[PDB]
Coordinates of C-alpha atoms and ligand atoms in Angstrom, one line a residue:
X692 CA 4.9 50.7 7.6
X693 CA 3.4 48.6 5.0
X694 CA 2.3 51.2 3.0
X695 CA 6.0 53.4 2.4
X696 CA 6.7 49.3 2.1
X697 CA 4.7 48.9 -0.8
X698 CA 5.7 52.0 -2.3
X699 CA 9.5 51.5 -1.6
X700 CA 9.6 48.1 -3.4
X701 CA 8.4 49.1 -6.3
X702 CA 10.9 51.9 -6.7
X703 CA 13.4 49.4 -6.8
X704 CA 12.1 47.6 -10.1
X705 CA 11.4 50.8 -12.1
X706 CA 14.9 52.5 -13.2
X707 CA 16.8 50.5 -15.9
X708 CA 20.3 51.9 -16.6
X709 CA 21.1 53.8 -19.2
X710 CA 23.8 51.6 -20.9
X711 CA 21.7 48.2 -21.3
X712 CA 19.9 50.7 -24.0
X713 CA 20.6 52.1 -27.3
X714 CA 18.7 54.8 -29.0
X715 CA 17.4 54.5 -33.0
X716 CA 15.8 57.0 -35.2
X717 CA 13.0 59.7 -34.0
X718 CA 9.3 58.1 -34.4
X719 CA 7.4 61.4 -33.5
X720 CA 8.3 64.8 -31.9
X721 CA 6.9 67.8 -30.2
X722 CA 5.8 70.2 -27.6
X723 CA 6.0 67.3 -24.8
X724 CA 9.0 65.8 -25.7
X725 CA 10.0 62.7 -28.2
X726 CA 9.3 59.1 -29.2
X727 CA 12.4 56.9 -30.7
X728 CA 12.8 53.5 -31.7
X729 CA 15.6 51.6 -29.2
X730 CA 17.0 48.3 -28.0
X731 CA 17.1 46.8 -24.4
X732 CA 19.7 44.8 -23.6
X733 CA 17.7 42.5 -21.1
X734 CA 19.0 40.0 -18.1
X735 CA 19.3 37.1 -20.5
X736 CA 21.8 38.1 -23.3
X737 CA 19.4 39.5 -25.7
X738 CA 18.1 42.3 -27.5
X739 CA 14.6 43.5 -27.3
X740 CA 12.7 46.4 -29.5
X741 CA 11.3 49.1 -27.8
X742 CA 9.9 52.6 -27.9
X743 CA 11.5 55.4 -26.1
X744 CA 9.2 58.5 -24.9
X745 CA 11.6 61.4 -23.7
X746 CA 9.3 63.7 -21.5
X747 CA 10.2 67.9 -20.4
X748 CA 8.6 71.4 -13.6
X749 CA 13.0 70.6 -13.8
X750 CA 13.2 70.6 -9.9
X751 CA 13.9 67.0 -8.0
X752 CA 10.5 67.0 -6.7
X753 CA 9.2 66.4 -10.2
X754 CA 11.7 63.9 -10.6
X755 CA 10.6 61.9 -7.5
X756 CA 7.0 62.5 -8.1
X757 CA 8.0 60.8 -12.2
X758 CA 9.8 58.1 -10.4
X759 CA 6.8 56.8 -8.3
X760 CA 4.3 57.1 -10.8
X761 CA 6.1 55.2 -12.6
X762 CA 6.4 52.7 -10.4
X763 CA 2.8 52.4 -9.8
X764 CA 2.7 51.9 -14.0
X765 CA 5.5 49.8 -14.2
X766 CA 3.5 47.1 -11.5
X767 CA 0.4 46.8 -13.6
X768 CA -0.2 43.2 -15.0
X769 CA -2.8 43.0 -17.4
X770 CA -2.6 42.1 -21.3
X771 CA -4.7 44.9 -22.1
X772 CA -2.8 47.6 -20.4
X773 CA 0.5 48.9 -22.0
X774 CA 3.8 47.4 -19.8
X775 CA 5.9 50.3 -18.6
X776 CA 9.4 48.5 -19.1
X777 CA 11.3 51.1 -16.7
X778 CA 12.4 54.4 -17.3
X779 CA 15.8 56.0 -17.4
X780 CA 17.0 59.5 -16.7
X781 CA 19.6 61.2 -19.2
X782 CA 21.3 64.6 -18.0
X783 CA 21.8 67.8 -20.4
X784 CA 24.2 70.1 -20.2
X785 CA 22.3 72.3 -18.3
X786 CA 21.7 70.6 -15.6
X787 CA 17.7 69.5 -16.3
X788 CA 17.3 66.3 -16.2
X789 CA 15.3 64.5 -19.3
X790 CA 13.5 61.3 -18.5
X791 CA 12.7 58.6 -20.4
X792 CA 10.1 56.2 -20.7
X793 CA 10.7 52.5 -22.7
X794 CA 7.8 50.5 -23.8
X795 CA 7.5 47.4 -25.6
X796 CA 7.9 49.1 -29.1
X797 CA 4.1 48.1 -31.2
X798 CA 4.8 48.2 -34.7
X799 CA 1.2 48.1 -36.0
X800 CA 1.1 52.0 -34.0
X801 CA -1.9 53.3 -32.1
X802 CA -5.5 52.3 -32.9
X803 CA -6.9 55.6 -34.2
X804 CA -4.3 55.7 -36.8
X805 CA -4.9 52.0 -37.9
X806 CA -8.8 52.4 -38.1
X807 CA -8.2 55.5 -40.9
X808 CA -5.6 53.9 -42.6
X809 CA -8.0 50.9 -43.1
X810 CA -9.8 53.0 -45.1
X811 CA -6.8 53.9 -47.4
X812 CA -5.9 50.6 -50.4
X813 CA -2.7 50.3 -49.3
X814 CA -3.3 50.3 -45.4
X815 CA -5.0 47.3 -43.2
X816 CA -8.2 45.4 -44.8
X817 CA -11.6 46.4 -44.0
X818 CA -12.3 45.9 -40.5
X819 CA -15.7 44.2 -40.1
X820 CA -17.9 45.2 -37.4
X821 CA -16.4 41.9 -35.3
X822 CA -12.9 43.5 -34.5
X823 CA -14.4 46.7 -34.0
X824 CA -16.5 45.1 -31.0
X825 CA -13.1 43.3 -30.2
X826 CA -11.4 46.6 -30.1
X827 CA -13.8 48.0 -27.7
X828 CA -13.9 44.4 -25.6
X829 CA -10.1 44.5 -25.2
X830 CA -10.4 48.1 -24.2
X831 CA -13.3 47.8 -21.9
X832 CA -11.1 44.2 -20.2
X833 CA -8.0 47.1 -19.8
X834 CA -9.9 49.5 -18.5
X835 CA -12.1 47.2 -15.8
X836 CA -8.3 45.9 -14.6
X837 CA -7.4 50.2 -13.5
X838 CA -10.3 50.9 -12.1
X839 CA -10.5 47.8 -10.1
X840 CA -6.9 49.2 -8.5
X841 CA -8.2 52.9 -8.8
X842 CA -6.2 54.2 -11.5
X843 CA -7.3 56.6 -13.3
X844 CA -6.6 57.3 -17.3
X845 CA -7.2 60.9 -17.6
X846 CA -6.9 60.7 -21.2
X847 CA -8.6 57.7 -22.9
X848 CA -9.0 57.7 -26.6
X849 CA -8.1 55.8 -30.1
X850 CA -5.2 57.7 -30.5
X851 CA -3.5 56.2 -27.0
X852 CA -4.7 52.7 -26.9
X853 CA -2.1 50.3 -28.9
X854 CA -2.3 47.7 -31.3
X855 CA -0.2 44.4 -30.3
X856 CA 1.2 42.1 -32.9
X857 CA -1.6 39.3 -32.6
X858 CA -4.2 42.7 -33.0
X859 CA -4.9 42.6 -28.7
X860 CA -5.7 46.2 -28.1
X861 CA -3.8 47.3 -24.9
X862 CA -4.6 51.1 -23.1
X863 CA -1.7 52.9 -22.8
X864 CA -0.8 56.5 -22.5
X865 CA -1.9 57.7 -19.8
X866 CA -2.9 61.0 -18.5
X867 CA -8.4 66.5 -25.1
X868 CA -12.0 68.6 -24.5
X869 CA -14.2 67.0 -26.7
X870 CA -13.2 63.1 -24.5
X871 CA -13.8 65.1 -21.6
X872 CA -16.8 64.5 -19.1
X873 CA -19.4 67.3 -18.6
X874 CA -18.9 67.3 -14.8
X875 CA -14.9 67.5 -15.7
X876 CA -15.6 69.9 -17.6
X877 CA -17.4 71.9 -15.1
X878 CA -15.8 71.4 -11.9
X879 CA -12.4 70.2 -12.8
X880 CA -13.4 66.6 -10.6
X881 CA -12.6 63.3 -12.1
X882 CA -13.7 60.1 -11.4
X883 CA -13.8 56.4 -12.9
X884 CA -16.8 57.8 -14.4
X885 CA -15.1 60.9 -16.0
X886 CA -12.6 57.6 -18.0
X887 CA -16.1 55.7 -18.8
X888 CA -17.2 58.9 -20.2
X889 CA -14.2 59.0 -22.1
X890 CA -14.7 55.0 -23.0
X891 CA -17.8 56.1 -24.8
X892 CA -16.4 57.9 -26.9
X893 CA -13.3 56.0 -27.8
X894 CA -16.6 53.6 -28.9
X895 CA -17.8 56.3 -30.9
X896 CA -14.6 56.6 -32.8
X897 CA -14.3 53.3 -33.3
X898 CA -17.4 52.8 -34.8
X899 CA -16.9 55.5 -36.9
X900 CA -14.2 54.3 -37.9
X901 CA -11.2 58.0 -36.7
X902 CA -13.9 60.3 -37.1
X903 CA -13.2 63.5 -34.8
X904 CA -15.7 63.7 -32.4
X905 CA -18.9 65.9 -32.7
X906 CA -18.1 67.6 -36.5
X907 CA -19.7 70.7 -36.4
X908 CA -18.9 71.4 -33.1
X909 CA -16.3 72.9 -31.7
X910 CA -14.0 73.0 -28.5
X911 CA -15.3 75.9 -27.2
X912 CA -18.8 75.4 -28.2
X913 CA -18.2 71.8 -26.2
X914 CA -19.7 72.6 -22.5
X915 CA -22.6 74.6 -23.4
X916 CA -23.1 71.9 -26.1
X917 CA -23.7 69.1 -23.6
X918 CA -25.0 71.4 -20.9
X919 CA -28.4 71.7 -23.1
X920 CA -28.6 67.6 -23.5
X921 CA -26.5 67.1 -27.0
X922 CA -24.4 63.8 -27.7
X923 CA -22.6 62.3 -29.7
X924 CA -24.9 60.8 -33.3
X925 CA -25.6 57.1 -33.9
X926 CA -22.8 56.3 -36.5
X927 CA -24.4 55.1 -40.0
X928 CA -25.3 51.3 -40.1
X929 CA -24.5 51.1 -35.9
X930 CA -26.3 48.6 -33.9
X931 CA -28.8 50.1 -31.6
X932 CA -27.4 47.8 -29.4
X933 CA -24.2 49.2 -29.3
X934 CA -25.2 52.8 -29.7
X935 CA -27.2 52.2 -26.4
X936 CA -24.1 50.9 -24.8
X937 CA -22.0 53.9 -25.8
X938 CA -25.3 56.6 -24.8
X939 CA -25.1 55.3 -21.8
X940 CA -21.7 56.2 -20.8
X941 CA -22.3 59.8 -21.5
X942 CA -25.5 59.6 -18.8
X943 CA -25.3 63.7 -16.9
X944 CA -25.1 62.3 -13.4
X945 CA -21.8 60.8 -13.4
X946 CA -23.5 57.6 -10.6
X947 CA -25.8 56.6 -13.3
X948 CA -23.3 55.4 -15.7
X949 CA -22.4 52.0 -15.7
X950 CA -18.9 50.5 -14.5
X951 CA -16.4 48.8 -16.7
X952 CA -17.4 45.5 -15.6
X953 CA -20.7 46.3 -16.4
X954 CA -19.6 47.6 -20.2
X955 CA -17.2 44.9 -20.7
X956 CA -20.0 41.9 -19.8
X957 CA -22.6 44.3 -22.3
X958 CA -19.5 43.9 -24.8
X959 CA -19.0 40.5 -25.0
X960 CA -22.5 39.6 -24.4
X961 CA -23.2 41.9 -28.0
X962 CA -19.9 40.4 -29.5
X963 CA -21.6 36.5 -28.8
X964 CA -24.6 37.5 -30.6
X965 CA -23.2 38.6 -33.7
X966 CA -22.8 35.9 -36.9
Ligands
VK5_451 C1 2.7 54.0 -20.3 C2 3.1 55.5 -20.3 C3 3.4 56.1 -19.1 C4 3.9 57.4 -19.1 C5 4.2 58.1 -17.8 C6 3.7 59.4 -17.5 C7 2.7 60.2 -18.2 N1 4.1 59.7 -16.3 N2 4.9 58.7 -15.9 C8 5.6 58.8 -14.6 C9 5.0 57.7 -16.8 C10 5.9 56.5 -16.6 C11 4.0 58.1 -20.4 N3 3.8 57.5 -21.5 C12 3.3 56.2 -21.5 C13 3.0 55.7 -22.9 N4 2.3 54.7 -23.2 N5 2.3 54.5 -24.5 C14 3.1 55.4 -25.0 N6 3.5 55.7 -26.2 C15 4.6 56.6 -26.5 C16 2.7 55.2 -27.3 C17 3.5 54.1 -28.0 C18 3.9 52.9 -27.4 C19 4.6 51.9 -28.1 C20 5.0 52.2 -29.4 N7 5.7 51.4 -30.3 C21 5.8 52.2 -31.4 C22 5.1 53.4 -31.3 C23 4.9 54.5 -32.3 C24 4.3 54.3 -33.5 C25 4.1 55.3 -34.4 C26 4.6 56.6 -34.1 C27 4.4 57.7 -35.1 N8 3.3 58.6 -34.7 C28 2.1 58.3 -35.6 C29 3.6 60.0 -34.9 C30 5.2 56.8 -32.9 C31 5.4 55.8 -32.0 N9 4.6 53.4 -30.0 C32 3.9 54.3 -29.3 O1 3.6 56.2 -24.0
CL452 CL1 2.4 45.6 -23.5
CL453 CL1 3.8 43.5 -29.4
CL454 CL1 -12.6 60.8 -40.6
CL455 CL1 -21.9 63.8 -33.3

């Protein structure tokens, strides 16, 4: 039918083979797997930059259930959302297959890091309260394009949306407690609401500039916490305006929080208003 149609065609874009790229140095490394530096040789002759994720279930299932969610990421279109280039799948010696992701490589990093290291001399200026909204605009624009094709996040925060080299914020990443909904908390359930949960407190962090959330609290302490009412605190010298935006995302019954539509138009609306 139309809809193994669908899915079928965009299989066919995702996989890129494994000799139009070349491998660099190791950018970060861990328990899920790694992130290098690489080239793509692309359809017209040249060379692009690009980051390499290199992910750990070994069976072929897995493998197929990688490959179409990866074609579902690789057909978003939006300038605020990461492009998922293609992926690629090496082979150990084992037999276990390793996948590979390859993104537009972004050398200004992710956003959490950038807003602490503009605190540092040496890192980015000060970064008035203007790009801050900005951040939070482009985020919102990103995040208003998924849910409008019912994607869901799973795992928005500073740390995984991505600076672009003219400073457009793009969401990327995708899937933590304390970014973590109360009803997701509760009844393992996510919704668009659970990621505008989430968007709040990206906000948070961004008005605060990489603070952790909720100091003084801590992961396990985090359900209880918000069962008895608590939220996140009005950052110092933070708009009431935007505070009220960001409260509002963290609203106990998930239908009384706004959309991202909603929060991008309060956004922009804010971000006019400001000299
Ligand atoms: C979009 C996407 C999808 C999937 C996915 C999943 C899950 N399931 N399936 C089926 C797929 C296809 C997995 N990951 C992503 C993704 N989106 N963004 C990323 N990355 C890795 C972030 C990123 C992106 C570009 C980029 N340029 C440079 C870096 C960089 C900068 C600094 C460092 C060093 N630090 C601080 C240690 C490291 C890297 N950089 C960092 O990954
Ligand atoms: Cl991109
Ligand atoms: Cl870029
Ligand atoms: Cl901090
Ligand atoms: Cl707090």
């Amino acid at each position: 039918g139309s809809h193994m149609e669908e899915l079928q065609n965009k299989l066919e874009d995702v996989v890129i083979d494994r000799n139009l790229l070349i491998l660099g140095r190791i950018l970060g490394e861990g328990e899920f797997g790694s992130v290098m530096e690489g080239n793509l040789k692309q359809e017209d002759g040249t060379s692009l930059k690009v980051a390499v994720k290199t992910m750990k279930n070994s069976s072929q299932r897995e493998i197929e259930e990688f490959l179409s969610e990866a074609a579902c990421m690789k057909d978003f279109s939006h300038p605020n959302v990461i492009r998922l280039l293609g992926v690629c799948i090496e082979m150990s010696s084992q037999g276990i297959p390793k996948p590979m992701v390859i993104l537009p490589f972004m050398k200004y990093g992710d956003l959490h890091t950038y807003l602490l290291y503009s605190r540092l001399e040496t890192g980015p200026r000060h970064i008035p309260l203007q790009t801050l909204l900005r951040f939070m605009v482009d985020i919102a624009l990103g995040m208003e394009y998924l849910s409008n094709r019912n994607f869901l996040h799973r795992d928005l925060a500073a740390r995984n949306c991505m600076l672009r080299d003219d400073m457009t914020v793009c969401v990327a990443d995708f899937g933590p407690v304390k970014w973590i909904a109360i009803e997701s908390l509760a009844d393992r359930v996510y919704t668009s609401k659970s990621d505008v949960w989430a968007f709040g407190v990206t906000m948070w962090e961004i008005a605060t500039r990489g603070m952790t959330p909720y100091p003084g609290v801590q992961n396990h302490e985090m359900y209880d916490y918000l069962l008895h009412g608590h939220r996140l605190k009005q950052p110092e010298d933070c708009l009431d305006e935007l505070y009220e935006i960001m409260y509002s995302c963290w609203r106990t019954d998930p239908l009384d929080r706004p959309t991202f539509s909603v929060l991008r138009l309060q956004l922009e609306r804010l971000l006019e208003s400001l000299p």
